Write a protein that binds this ligand. Structure first.
Ligand code: NA
Ligand code: NA
Ligand code: NA
Ligand code: NA
Length: 104
């Protein structure tokens, strides 16, 4: 399996996880005051999908970095005890499991 197919499958697993929904689309600032002032490099699953479909990823590392940035953004904006941070931790473990399966 080539890296890009592997990436597609990983994104599929992450999307399928019960806690993916806050991460599926770009953040709507109407429900996240000052989000784009606080977060330097926003990232979401649909954007990763589109980069992958548009062949904009050069390497596995770029893909992984977008995923990790997405989770860091969440933790930074929402705080440790937040519902969204709980979800980000579950989803990051989902990501890790998926990576081990599809990048063995
Ligand atoms: Na930031
Ligand atoms: Na919060
Ligand atoms: Na786990
Ligand atoms: Na899972």
């Amino acid at each position: 399996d080539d890296d890009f197919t592997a990436m597609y499958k990983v994104l599929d697993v992450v999307k399928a996880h019960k806690d993916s929904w806050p991460f599926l689309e770009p953040v709507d600032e109407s429900y996240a005051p000052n989000y784009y002032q606080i977060i330097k490099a926003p990232m979401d699953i649909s954007s990763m999908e589109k980069k992958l479909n548009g062949g904009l990823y050069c390497t596995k590392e770029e893909f992984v970095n977008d995923m990790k940035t997405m989770f860091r953004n969440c933790r930074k904006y929402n705080g440790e005890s937040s519902e969204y941070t709980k979800m980000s931790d579950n989803l990051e473990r989902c990501f890790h499991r998926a990576m081990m399966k599809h990048f063995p």
